[PDB]
Amino acid sequence: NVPAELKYSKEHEWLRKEADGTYTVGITEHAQELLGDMVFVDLPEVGATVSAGDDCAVAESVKAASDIYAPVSGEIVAVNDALSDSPELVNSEPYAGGWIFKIKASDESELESLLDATAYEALLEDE
């Protein structure tokens, strides 16, 4: 299980190119299984300039306070303040309702150097 239409990163995040040129971000199934039952998601500041590889949110699961990084630099568009009420959504719907935030990719030369779907499992059978 790894939505073939989505791009992925080293830190186990999934990006979805939104028609309106924007970008939705969340954590991969595999990742949210390792973490654990989510109890609170620390969302990044709404309207914040972030860089790729930069920690922009902290996931607190019964198991630990885990770091979540932004795969691509840019402007913090929106945040799923639906999680600030149902953090479990990150476990149940890692790709659906468990979406963390959206963004605008300031410099899109970063997409070039990422991993596709099939390139994710290849990473999973090691890391």
Partner: protein
């Protein structure tokens, strides 16, 4: 020589929390780091905790008991010199909570104390009148790192602990993590005269046995800055009301009071420490100034001084009620303390 041993001779929680992170961030990829430290009269809370809800911030302030929000998650715990802190740091994919957990349980055994891990975050011992929690743990993990820090109740003041962790009966509706209440006890009735430097040796020895090597301990002085990189900046942040109190997840506060002139109730929506919107309901024959306050009170800092500022700055507009707005500010300042 990939193990590192750090001992903080400072009891400033802000100092100590700054140090923990720095080490943690600038930590080499193949080390295993043990950090021993404790904090004088302090209340330490997890990332997403509402301080005003999880501890008695008013009592805390009256006795200058320090508040410090930590990078890890978890509930609110109390620290005096009777509380010993331990942090285990190790890179991935080697990092494993359970490994450091047993190392600590090992140290306890070596001293003669027998405790079993409980739940996901606790260390307890058996006793005549039930079970007793003697430890509490929280964890933070990044992409490449991870650290497990926890507390050992040696000879702490349990009544002060109980005191500050028992918050005022405020009307709060808040997101964030709430504290899980256990019954605690001191390791002192299992091992009389137990000191900090005693428990330190234990945990150091077990730690040394596990990874089968040793290294001279490095002592971090309290009076003077650690050469660790990026410090001043972290310390300054760790010490900031913006972080300790400000990081509070959205919550609302309902406060009320009878004034011989009428009843006042105030609703506050709070976000990153600032009142995003306030409302007033009152049977006063003079709503004018109060209804004006609720508006003017936007963006204000959820704190006594600012609240009292916006008040005095209101007198200058409604002098016919200087007396009342005087009591108001007076009551309002303590109510949020």
């Amino acid at each position: 020589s990939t193990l590192r041993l750090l001992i903080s001779d400072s009891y400033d929680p802000w100092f100590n929390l700054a140090v923990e992170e720095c080490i943690f961030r600038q930590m080499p990829a193949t080390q295993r780091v043990l950090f021993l430290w404790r904090n004088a009269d302090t209340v330490v809370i997890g990332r997403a905790q509402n301080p005003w809800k999880e501890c008695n911030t008013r009592r805390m302030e009256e006795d200058n008991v320090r508040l410090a929000r930590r990078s890890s998650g978890g509930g609110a715990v109390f620290h005096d010199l009777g509380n010993t802190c331990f942090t285990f740091m190790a890179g991935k994919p080697e990092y494993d909570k359970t490994i450091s957990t047993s190392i600590v349980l090992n140290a306890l055994n070596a001293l003669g104390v027998s405790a079993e891990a409980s739940g996901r975050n606790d260390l307890v011992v058996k006793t005549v009148e039930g079970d007793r929690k003697v430890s509490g743990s929280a964890y933070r993990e990044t992409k490449d790192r991870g650290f497990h820090h926890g507390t050992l109740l040696l000879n702490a003041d349990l009544s002060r602990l109980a005191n500050y962790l028992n918050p005022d009966k405020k009307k709060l509706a808040a997101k964030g993590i709430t504290s899980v209440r256990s019954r605690v006890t001191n390791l002192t009735e299992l091992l009389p005269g137990i000191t900090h430097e005693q428990v330190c040796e234990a945990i150091t020895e077990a730690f040394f046995a596990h990874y089968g090597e040793r290294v001279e301990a490095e002592i971090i002085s309290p009076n003077k800055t650690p050469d660790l990189p990026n410090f001043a900046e972290t310390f300054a942040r760790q010490s900031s009301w913006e972080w300790n109190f400000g990081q509070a997840p959205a919550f609302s506060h309902l406060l009320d009071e009878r004034f011989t002139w009428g009843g006042v109730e105030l609703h506050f929506d709070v976000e990153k420490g600032h009142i995003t919107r306030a409302q007033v309901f009152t049977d006063s024959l003079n709503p004018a100034p109060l209804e004006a306050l609720a508006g003017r009170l936007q963006g204000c800092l959820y704190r006594a001084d600012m609240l009292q500022q916006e008040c005095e700055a209101l007198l200058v507009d409604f002098p016919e009620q200087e007396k009342e707005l005087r009591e108001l500010s007076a009551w309002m300042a303590g109510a949020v303390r």
